[PDB]
Structures are given as C-alpha cells and as structure tokens.
Nucleic acid binder design. Sequence first.
RNA 1: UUGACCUCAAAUCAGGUAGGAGUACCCGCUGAACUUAAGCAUAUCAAUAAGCGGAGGAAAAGAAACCAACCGGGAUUGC
RNA 2: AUAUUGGCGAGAGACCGAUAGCGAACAAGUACAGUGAUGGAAAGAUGAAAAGAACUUUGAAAAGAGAGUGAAAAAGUACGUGAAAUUGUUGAAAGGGAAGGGCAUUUGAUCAGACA
RNA 3: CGUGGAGGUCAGUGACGAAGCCUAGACCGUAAGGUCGGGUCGAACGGCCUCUAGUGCAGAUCUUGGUGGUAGUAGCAAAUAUUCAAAUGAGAACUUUGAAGACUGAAGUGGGGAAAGGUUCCACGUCAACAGCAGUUGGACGUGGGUUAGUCGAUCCUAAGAGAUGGGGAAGCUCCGUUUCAAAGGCCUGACAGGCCACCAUCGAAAGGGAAUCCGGUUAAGAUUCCGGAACCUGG
RNA 4: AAACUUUCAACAACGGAUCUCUUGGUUCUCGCAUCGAUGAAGAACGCAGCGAAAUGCGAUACGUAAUGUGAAUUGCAGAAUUCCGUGAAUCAUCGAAUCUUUGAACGCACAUUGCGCCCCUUGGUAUUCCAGGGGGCAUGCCUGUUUGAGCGUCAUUU
Lengths: 81, 88, 50, 126, 118, 207
Amino acid sequence: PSFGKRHNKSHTLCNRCGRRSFHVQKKTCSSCGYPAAKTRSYNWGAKAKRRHTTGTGRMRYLKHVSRRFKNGFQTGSASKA
Amino acid sequence: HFRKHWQERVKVHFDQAGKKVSRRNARATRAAKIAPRPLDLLRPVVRAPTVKYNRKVRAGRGFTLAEVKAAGLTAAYARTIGIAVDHR
Amino acid sequence: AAQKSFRIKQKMAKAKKQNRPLPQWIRLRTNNTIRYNAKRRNWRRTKMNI
Amino acid sequence: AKQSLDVSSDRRKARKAYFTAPSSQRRVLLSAPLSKELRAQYGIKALPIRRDDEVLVVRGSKKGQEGKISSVYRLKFAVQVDKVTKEKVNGASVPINLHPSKLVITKLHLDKDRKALIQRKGGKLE
Amino acid sequence: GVKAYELRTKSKEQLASQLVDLKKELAELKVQKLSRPSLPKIKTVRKSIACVLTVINEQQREAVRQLYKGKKYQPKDLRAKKTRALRRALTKFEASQVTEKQRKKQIAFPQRKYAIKA
Amino acid sequence: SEKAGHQTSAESWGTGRAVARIPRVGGGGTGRSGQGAFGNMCRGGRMFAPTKTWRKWNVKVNHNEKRYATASAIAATAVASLVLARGHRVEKIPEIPLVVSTDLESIQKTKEAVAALKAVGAHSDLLKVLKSKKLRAGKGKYRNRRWTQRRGPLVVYAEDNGIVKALRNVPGVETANVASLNLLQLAPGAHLGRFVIWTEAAFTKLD
RNA sequence: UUGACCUCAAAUCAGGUAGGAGUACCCGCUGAACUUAAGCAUAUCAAUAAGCGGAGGAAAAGAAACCAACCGGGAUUGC
RNA sequence: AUAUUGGCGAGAGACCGAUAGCGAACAAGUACAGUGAUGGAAAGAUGAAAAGAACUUUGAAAAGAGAGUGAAAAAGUACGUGAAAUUGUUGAAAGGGAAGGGCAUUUGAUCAGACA
RNA sequence: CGUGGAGGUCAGUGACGAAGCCUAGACCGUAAGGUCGGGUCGAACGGCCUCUAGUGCAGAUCUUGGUGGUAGUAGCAAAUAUUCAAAUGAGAACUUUGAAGACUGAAGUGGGGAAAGGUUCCACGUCAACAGCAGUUGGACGUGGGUUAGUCGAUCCUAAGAGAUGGGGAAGCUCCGUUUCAAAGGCCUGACAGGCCACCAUCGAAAGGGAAUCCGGUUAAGAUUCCGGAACCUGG
RNA sequence: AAACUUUCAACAACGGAUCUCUUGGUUCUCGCAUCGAUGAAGAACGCAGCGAAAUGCGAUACGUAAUGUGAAUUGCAGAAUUCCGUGAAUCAUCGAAUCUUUGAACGCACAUUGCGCCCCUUGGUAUUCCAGGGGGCAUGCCUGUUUGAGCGUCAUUU
Ligand SMILES: [Zn+2]
C-alpha cells in the first residue's frame, strides 16, 4: 500500500527523442543526452543503436542520394524527344 | 596458442578465386588503357645478398644512373620509354 | 490535471483519433490480411505514459 | 542458358519481381498472342492487351467463348471480358478473371501508338 | 483538370485571379462535403491549385536567374545543392593548377607511347 | 550467426519448486518474460556447435592421384561393360571408343549437331535424357536444385569452332577439351564409364 | 597640434568555414578484471572489450638518418 | 596491391524451412512491462476465382435444418492435410479392497493364404 | 536399420490420387525397422552404389505450447436491507418510473478542487465479448456532440537553488565558477567633438509577491469565460 | 441386470503435431562511394472522397510540375473523355520546386506552441495607434573592408 503516493513524475518528454525520459531535477534526458549536443551512442548497448539509428523512420533526404549520385548530381530538364 | 580470444579475428581466404578474377580484369583494363605499352617496366638483373642466395640473381628495382649514362641516355627519357631507375 | 500543456493536448488528439476501429470498406480489398485493428487502445486498460 | 552476371535464376527473386512489380511492367506481363490470321496480317506473334479489344478464348472451362474486354485488373493479373460471367445465386452476375496468356485476339482497337508499336515490332499492318 | 502548359503562357495577374477563383471554389466544396457523403472533384481542384503555384514559383525563379545571370554570388537556394563535401572541395581547374617546374617537366619528358617488337 | 541467442539478457534464479536452473528472460508483460534462453534445448536459444565458416570445405588432393584417376576414367570407355551398366543405352552402335571427323568442330548449329548424333546412334541416350526430367526429391527445390535429369554423352572437342555453342543447350550433353577432361564430367558419382564421342584430332592429341 | 607604423579591439560588416548523426573497416589517447599460473603476488588473458577524440572510400605508412656484413641489396603495404 | 558483421546495386549456395533461421517470413524493434536506463514477444497457408452461401422454414438473435455455388464443404473467414494426451455418443466385453505384463489354452469377434 | 540434404542410377512412382496420417486387417525380419490392403487426403516422392551432416530420446526440480484428475469441489459470507404494481421487451431477485422501508447523519455514501488520468463528460443505437451471478442497464462496444475569458490562472518577480559567457584546468567526454584577474553596455544636451552614469546575464512557485468583475439567465453537457444588463484596470 | 469404472473400433469434439509450399533469414562473393549549417539522421503533429496502422507525403500535404511509357485505378463511389491522343494510373524515371513545429539548432528561453529587437510593405478613418504579410538578429575562427583605442616606437608643432 506504499504506492498510493506515486502521482509525482520524475520523467517526462524530450523534445528530441520522444521517449518520456527527460529527468526534471537534472534537466537532462537519459536516452539522447539533451540539452547536450552529442546524441547518446553507447556501444555496450547495440539494440539501442539498432532502435534509434538510420533507416528507421522517414529519411526525407538521404533516401534520394543513391538516385542522385547514380544520375550524377545533374541540373536541368529533359529534351522532349 | 589460443588462450586469447582469437575467435573474433580469423581471416578465411575464400575470396582467393574472386580476387584472382578481379586481378586479371584489372591487368587487362590497365593494359587496354595503356594499349600499346607492355604493362611492365624493364627491370635489371642483380646478384643477391646473404651468401645462402648469392649464387642466384634477382630482378631488382631499377637499373642505375651510371649504367643509363653508359647507354648514353638520361633517366628522364628512360621513365617515359618504359625503363625503371633506382638512384640509391 | 486540466492545467495541461498544449503538447499534452496535442498527443491526446492523436490517441483520440487513433482510437477508432477499422473502417469496414478496407475489409474487401484485394489481398488484405488486416482484419482487426490491433494497435487499438482504451484508457483504463493501457496507459500511454503521456 | 544464362551466360550473364546481372540476371537471376532464383525463385525467391523472381516471384517477388512478379508480384510486387509495377503496373507498367504488368502491362507487359499480361501480354497475349494473336490469331494466326492476325499473325499473317500484321507480321507479329504477340502483344500487350487493351480495354477495347475483341478476343476469343482457347483454354479453360470457357473455351469457345469470346467477346470484348470491359476491364483489365492488373492487380490480380487478370482480364474481364463481358458475356463471360457467372450468375450469383441472387440474380447478380460477376466478371471472370482470366489470364491473357490463355486468350487469342481476333480484333483490336488500334491507335496511333499501336501502329507505331507494330512498326516497332516488325509491322505488316497495311 | 488544369494543364500546366496552358498556364506557362499566362500572366502573373491571370494566375493570381485564376488561383483565387480556385480557392473560393474549394471553400464552397468543403461545405458541400458536409451535405454529401463525399465529393471527388475537390481532388482535381486541390491539385489545380498546386499546378498554378508550382508554375508561379518556377517562373519567378527563372526571372531571378535572368536577373542574377552571368554573375558571381548568386543566392544560396539557386547555387547547386550537390553535397557538402562536393562543394567543400577542389575544382577541375584548381586540381589542374600545378607549378611551372612540373609543367616544364611534363612538357619536356612526357610518357611516350611505345611498344615491343623491334 | 555468431550471436544467435546472445541477443537475450537471461540469467538464472537459484532455487524454486516447479523451475529449472536454466536462465530465464528478464522483464515482464510480453510472454517471453520468464521464458528460458541460452541453451541447446530452449526455444529461441542457441545451438550446439554453432556452425562456423572455418570448416574444412575444400579438400586438398595430390596431383598425381588426380591424374591417375583421370587416366582410369578415360580407360573406362573402351570396355563398354561399365558403360552399359551405368546407363548409356548403347547396345545398337557397333564400335567403342567412338571417333568421328574433326569436321564436327566446325559445326555452328544445335540442329546439325544433334542430327549428327542421331545418325551415329545416340538417339537412345538423348531420348533417355529428355524423358527422365523429374523433380528433385526434397528441399533442393527452393535452393535452386529444382529439376534433375539423367546425364548423357560427352562430346570431346580438340578445338572449338562452334560445337560448344551448339551443344551448350541440348540436355544431357557436355563438351570438354582433351586438356581439361573434368573427372566430374567423366566419372560421375564415382561410377566409371561415361559415354563418349571423341574426334579424330582429339584422339590423336591424346597421345 | 598634425601624422606614418605596431599591437589590441567592435560591427546583424562583404564572402567563407567547423560542429551533429553514422561508425563494419581505419589513426590516435586513456585503459581494467574475471579467467590462467594444482594455490599466490611480478606475469598471462591485453598494449584487448568498455570510454573519448578524428577521417576517407579506403585510411595509415612511404622514396631510407633501412636491411646488412653477402660478388651486397634497395621506398611502402599485403601474402 | 591489402581490411571491411556498416551503407547502395547485383549473383550464387551439399545452409534453416515457422519451437529452426535475424529477436521479426504477417501493420516488429510494433503491441506490451518498467520512472527510466533498457528489457521484448506470440502470430504464415480456404479456394484456381468468393464462386464467402441469396431463397424456404424454426427460433429474439447467434445459429440450426433445408435448398444452393463449387471438383470436395471430409475446406464455411473458428477455413489445407488436422496426429497424441484428453473428451463425448454408439457397438462389443469385463468388474467383490487394485490395474497393467509374461507361458499355454478356452469362449466371442475378426482375418490372409490354397485346392485347380 | 533409420532420418534431413548431395553426386550418379532405376529412360522409376505420380490426379486413373505422391507424401503424411488413422487402422485389435495381412506378410517379413530375432531386432532396430521395412512391406502390403482399406479409409481420409490433395502434389510431390522413393529403391540401389557412394557422399556429408545441426542425424535417432522416456527421463535433464529440462524448454515452448497444449491438456487432465483434483471438481461442477473450495468458494462468490465484512460493509445492517430490501419489498409491491405498471412500462419496456421474447425474457427481469438486478434496468426505468411510481408507493412504502432503511442508511450515510454534515471531520458525510454531499458539492467543488490540486497531482495523476485523458473523451471516461452528454445523447442515440446496441450486447458477441467486460461488469468474477444474470443484464433490456453501464465509466463496456459503434457513431457523433461538447471545453468559448482584457478581469480565474500560467507568462512576470525573485526564494533555497541549478546554470551560460569571461577565463582557467582537463589527454578528453566536458569540468571549477556566476560577476569574478573583461575594452561586457546607453545615452543627454550641444558645436564629429566634449560630458554623466555602473549594473551585470538568464532559468526556478498554476499553494508564496502580484493591476482590474458582479449578478441573473442559458445547455443533453461548460461558465467569475457565452447571452442581457451593469462596473473596473492598463496602455494610447 | 442397468448405471458407473475400464480397453478397443468407428464417428465427432478440444489441440495444432506431421507432410507439402514459402515475396523471409543467414553465409559467401563481386562491383561502387553518396549524409549534414544551401540546414542531416531522428522525433512530433497533421495529409487521402470514403483510413486507424505499415508505405509515401508536408498547409502545393498517399502528392505538384518535367520526361518516357501509351488507357487506367479498383473494395465502393465518382471525374471519366483524356482515348489516332501536349495524355490515365497509388506507373516508372527524376534533373525544377514546396518542405509545418522541431532537432547539431541558430535572437532569448523551451515540463511554456511563452518573451523580444530591426527593416520594407499592406489594411483598418489615422503624422502618434492596432494588426497582418515578407525578410532578418547564434557562437568560435579565417581573409578582407569600414571604424576606433593605447605615449607602445617614431618624424614633424603651438
Ligand atoms: Zn530524448
């Protein structure tokens, strides 16, 4: 019955990570190190990198680079043969 | 000699065969790029060190300056013509 | 709470509009496996942890 | 046999490249032969398909039947010729999915592009 | 539907007027939505708007290019985009730049085209 | 992989009543909680002898021994008891070991080649093949071992002027130089006596 | 008084640049322990795993302040 | 030249074939637990094509019985084949604090072969 | 002997039904095991010489999944306590209404709030699940509706406190420090020249400080928010 | 004797083994070098005629324009003539473009969609006011410019 008194969060959202791990008394996340620049990349945990890394989400820009290099970083339009 | 953790560092030359084909293709490519030339520089004969091997000779690195001058040409033209040079 | 921040309201909107079952017209498409909405939610059953 | 280095001889590859292929490639996968009359006419064996073609069937239970396409359902790799339907119990009727490998055309709906195509494929049209 | 090549000839004011007509039409059709079950013409509308806006933003860019033509330091969103590294790196001329010593070298003693039978 | 099962955080408990000492998975709420891992036995654990790339795949052989075997394999043909036992429905043709013109090698055409073979009498063999197209027995079907057909003659060529491209395609058939002489082509399954059609030039070159 | 020069500064100064992710491979820095040594302690596991910096498509090294001790060889790297 | 469990595009296999193989062959690092660091699954198959059962009838309905589609409903979205524990109905048999097994035989059921 | 795969071979079996499975129906072999008939089933598979292996199970307080006895058993028993008729509908110990009976008995079984929860709030429709009975009811299910501010609050203040820049250390990730070994910032006339001032960031209280609003009415659901009326504060 | 218990056959049930498939996985090999301050990887919120998710996408929002292909999409509805054709599709390709709040994250801060500064311009009756729209304001460093300070050295003066 010593859990009636858990209504008082420590952890809440990070604007970067969206994981509900922003600690509040410390003003630091625990997953992504925010406010700090360098995103938390720890090699003892491999699943963590595997979750958070490249390829997961949108890749709005970087999905196009292979196409762009393959056609040679060109500018202009077609010729209307 | 395996008290260490060797099991992560092992090299297994499966790719001997594939490297060979890539290598022959590179040879042919360089030659077709270099089309009239013979793909190799003329290398001299030299007699080896280390008295075990002194009977032999060996295709060394480069001919000399002095021998080129005895032929009556220069290094500068030699390395265009297809001839090597060591100077040391 | 009800002194709630805008972003709390903003994620509540996503939950409230996710929490609908499957529109029936998807049931008849060609080569469909998606029969039940399985990421569906209730409010006493599962927290969302904000 | 395969004497190349950029084409596959594998089931796990080509079933995927069949199923998940675009419509632009299903246009070609749903080809069809021609009648030998049209073969003698145009100088060509086979073609892709079109909404406005007349056709006769040569295999399946529906052999001997014929008609005009009403639709081409590429997402099932099938074609729906009308006057080839099945009555439901309730009086309604259904089209019939057929593969255009198992049809033969007797008349086409030519356009400018189709004449250009037959010229591109050895045309003897006229 | 609307076809962009019809629009490439039109003037700026024709474009804005046409577009505003389309916006009014859209705001009508969003009300008609709530009466009807659905109204698929709104798709055609909402992409006609995009055709017009795309044409405008293309034309103004081309006019600005002709303004900034033949010039250095053209703006950032009209320089090429290629990549960070393949901007922050050396050009054709700048790698071909080479000192006069080695120019004389490559002039006097170049790799000659030879063979071996005789 | 090197890491089957290692993608788990299991650890053993100690002493219980319905339990084992096998390490159980940590956490809760997902069904794999409390399940066992890290063993030869357990569902979704590793295996015994996690196999490795560094097995002894390719085996060394002495060159003389390899050549001895090629010689014996070529000797196989002259007797024809081995051939008629292994397959090779030869019993009509008069002569063994066959030799034919060197003019065969100038052939550029599948049709002319197979017509020559039918004139010579390998009709029975190339109709044995092309009737023995059966499927594969097991799971080779979806590792690209799908069809299986019996083997057929071998047409030695001293020097190619198109015979190889004629006989590339008709099944059962293989071609082979006098220098290469693939023992796997000649003595398959360690059963001697493949049916062979030599040419005059290659037979002379064998000396 | 005026004025060359030096040094140190400010500018929403003109123009430019670096960070961060990725990180299999690669250059560096810092750097353990279990285990093993019938036990134990210098030692080994290890100039490794972890941590930190920094790059590329390869990097690093590299035309000798070398190996030698032979009729001397001849940059580097890998096998 | 050499290294390359990351990335991009390709080719193969004496590999695994759904409790194996990546942890995942399906809307998987998703659902889910945890304050959080982090942990972390189960889950494939109708049929060629829904032709996915209108219509008659009972019942509140689910549903059932009928009829019907289809090569088959002994494939009805609880869907390929559908084993075993275990469970029911029918048929046969036995039975006083044990059962099961072994050697031989009786009773009852059941059964293959040859007479030319 | 047997199993998954491989090289050959039996021009092998195979929709006129492969494989698997069931079978107190038969044959073989001492035995591992094989073979056959029938039924089911619907698409691949086997005999032989050789090869290669992730190769054979009663057991591991084994693993995963499933299923049994125990058993229609324990038990649904704290919270005084429910009763009668009508409607609904097919059906009411339980829903709704109406007549009685009781209770919380105002440091409540009342009405509002904080943290937390997040459409649970209200209607309509509806029960296959959930509400450890049943259910025509419901915080359950489907479809929708709904949260109105110059004045309540946050924002503003600073509290204990954490924390930039300067700078200095640290191999380094980043650390000590918070006005200090700083050229830190803006004006006031007044003809580019004179003159004065002195800080130091910034963040941290929906319960502390603090500018100002009441009533009545209104909805299925909110009001110091809307409507009707009537005042106030600040800055122009 | 029935019932009950118990063995078996058939039939049916629970349950999903076995058999046969398998757009997947691993392993090996080959080839190539391409993220980002011109604002990435990632996250959040929104987008479809009728959608919650996966996939795609950004208020131009399952997509715009360009090019090739040459008559679709498809569960329903509907635009369907655009069909001898500057033209269909959730096509392919992709070279012009858009890219919300965010993020290294950039005016200050950020458990807040809070608080400012500058400038061009439009509207509301406005010289003053209020609002809108557009573009801007990080830090360290480099080269250069423009502007200054210091008796720090120096030449020339009341
Ligand atoms: Zn974070």
